[PDB]
């Protein structure tokens, strides 16, 4: 049967999957899991995904509990022969490598910063520390873009979808003034029709964060 | 052109790659990058890998900067038809899913703990907090083993290699006794000839941590 996506659009990895789904016009059933109400700890979802995280994809008997696996799976099933998840091995490995950068480096550091806001209160966060950690991510991405026009090569791939949602989230706080290649790439991503899938969730994330913490991100 | 692996065996993800290299008898040129001396910030390596992390693999013009990419690449190049990185799509996705669990959950939480020891000092670390976080990973892995002998199924896969190295590192601090499936899995992993590639580096990590932090892990003799 058709894929089922457990989601909360405020989640950047969720938005990456939403962008792919829109890009490929994949017919998917959406099941909302409200992270703010802690619905990821509901007995049935916990049983389904012990990591209590979104996105989660159920496709037949297959249960995927990580956005990067979901991106790759959906690409291989609904974009067979496509260039998003390249056929050529070396090209595919480059995309995979960036997907892991997003998971291990960019998202980890953005998560550290955003969780700190929630836990400590906006005014009490060591912003200088997190500015350093996240600017380091900006620097790395700028380096990757000095070689290729997109993150993992000359064409749009799954890596760009994964990275742009988290990047847009980091950019709620930290400006991209000093990173021209990154800004050019980000602007190009925003021109994509699929980028609309990132829009609603990013603003709902901003709304929820700002309401909970009684603060405002810099304009 | 043979693959080149930049490594420090104290690194758990490095050890996962070392294990795979031994399992598949891959001819690789090892290049030691001493993390304790901050050699990952040397100009040439930093230029190669702006993440300044090991393992890093150079294979022709391909530069891989994450152990999970390295594992998959080496399996696809040197173990086509093998069970480590299954051909069947559903099985392959299951392995991939578990590799990402290692990266996003298990290693992240072990990293948080071990880095805290170095940055705060062993005596000052909120051990109760990290014990909760890492016990959660134990529980999850126990669940994954409910229906199979190995992490992603009945056969040893890349997922087992990635997970066991970090697992053994967590086990330096937190015991596995109360997790029957996980304990028997770990014991079985230790029986593999390839597990030797985890032994040397694991002990070196223990020795370095204990020397730097002036402490002893509870598992130490
Ligand atoms: N590496 C995972 C990260 C998943 C993740 O952290 N999801 C967050 C939303 S941004 C979540 O579900 N948090 C709920 C929780 O951890 O309890 C992926 O890419 O899917
Ligand atoms: N997700 C990465 C993690 C790599 C990693 O964190 N390596 C550590 C060794 S355990 C490192 O090189 N640290 C050096 C640094 O960050 O400066 C992978 O699986 O390869
Ligand atoms: N990773 C992640 C992303 C989003 C969320 N949300 C939306 C914003 C907030 S502020 C307090 C709780 C929540 C639930 N949680 C975790
Ligand atoms: N308890 C708790 C509640 C929310 C969070 N967040 C805030 C929103 C985002 S955006 C990317 C990561 C996160 C993590 N962390 C921990
Ligand atoms: N991830 C990671 C793994 C190992 C290392 N090492 C070996 C142990 C220690 S204790 C202080 C520095 C180092 C260098 N660093 C970072
Ligand atoms: N500055 C610094 C030096 C070492 C570390 N470590 C210690 C060894 C290990 S084993 C898994 C993760 C880590 C991280 N972190 C930060």
UniProtKB/Swiss-Prot annotation, chain A:
SUPFAM superfamilies linked to this entry: GST C-terminal domain-like, Thioredoxin-like
Disulfide bridge partners, by residue number: none
Domain GST C-terminal: 88-215
GO MF, one example: glutathione transferase activity
Enzyme class, first EC level, given as a word: transferase
Keyword Cytoplasm found: no
Tissue specificity field: Expressed in the adult ovary (at protein level).
Gene3D superfamilies: 1.20.1050.10, Glutaredoxin
Superkingdom in the source lineage: Eukaryota
E.C. code: 2.5.1.18
Classification via InterPro entries: Glutathione-S-Trfase_C-like, Glutathione-S-Trfase_C_sf, Glutathione_S-Trfase_N, GST_C, Thioredoxin-like_sf
Disruption-associated phenotype: Embryonic lethal. Embryos display severe developmental defects such as poorly differentiated cuticle, failure of head involution, abnormal gut looping, and defective mouth hooks and dorsal closure. Trichromes are absent. Embryos have a higher sterol content. Embryonic lethality, defective epidermal differentiation and trichome development can be rescued by supplementing embryos with 20-hydroxyecdysone (20E), ecdysone or cholesterol. RNAi-mediated knockdown results in larval lethality at the second instar stage, which can be rescued by supplementing larvae with 20E, ecdysone or cholesterol.
Domain GST N-terminal, chain residue ranges per copy: 1-82
The UniProt record lists the keyword Repeat: no
Catalysed reactions listed for this entry: RX + glutathione = an S-substituted glutathione + a halide anion + H(+)
GO biological process terms on file: cholesterol homeostasis; ecdysteroid biosynthetic process; glutathione metabolic process; response to toxic substance
PANTHER family (UniProt xref): GLUTATHIONE S TRANSFERASE D10, ISOFORM A-RELATED, GLUTATHIONE S-TRANSFERASE E14
Family from the record: Belongs to the GST superfamily. Epsilon family.
Function: Conjugation of reduced glutathione to a wide number of exogenous and endogenous hydrophobic electrophiles. Essential for ecdysteroid biosynthesis. May be involved in detoxification.
UniProt-recorded name of the protein: Glutathione S-transferase E14
Taxonomic source organism: Drosophila melanogaster
């Amino acid at each position: 049967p058709k894929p089922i996506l457990y989601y909360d659009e405020r989640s950047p990895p969720v938005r990456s999957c939403l962008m792919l789904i829109k890009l490929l016009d994949i017919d998917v059933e959406l099941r909302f899991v409200n992270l703010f109400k802690g619905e990821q700890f509901q007995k049935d979802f916990l049983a389904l995904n012990p990591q209590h995280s979104v996105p989660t994809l159920v496709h037949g008997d297959l249960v995927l509990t990580d956005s990067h696996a979901i991106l790759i799976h959906l690409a291989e099933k609904f974009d067979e022969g496509g260039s998003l998840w390249p056929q050529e091995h070396a090209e595919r490995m480059k995309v995979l490598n960036l997907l892991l950068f997003e998971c291990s480096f960019l998202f980890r550091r953005d998560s550290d910063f955003m969780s700190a806001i929630v836990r400590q209160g906006f005014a009490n966060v060591d912003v200088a520390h997190h500015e350093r950690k996240l600017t380091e991510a900006y620097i790395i991405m700028e380096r990757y873009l000095e070689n290729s026009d997109f993150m993992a090569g000359p064409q749009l791939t799954l890596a760009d979808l994964s990275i742009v949602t988290t990047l847009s989230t980091v950019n709620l706080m930290f400006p991209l003034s000093q990173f021209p290649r990154l800004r050019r790439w980000f602007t190009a991503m925003q021109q994509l029709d699929a980028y609309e899938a990132n829009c609603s969730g990013l603003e709902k994330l901003r709304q929820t964060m700002e309401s909970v913490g009684s603060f405002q991100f810099p304009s």
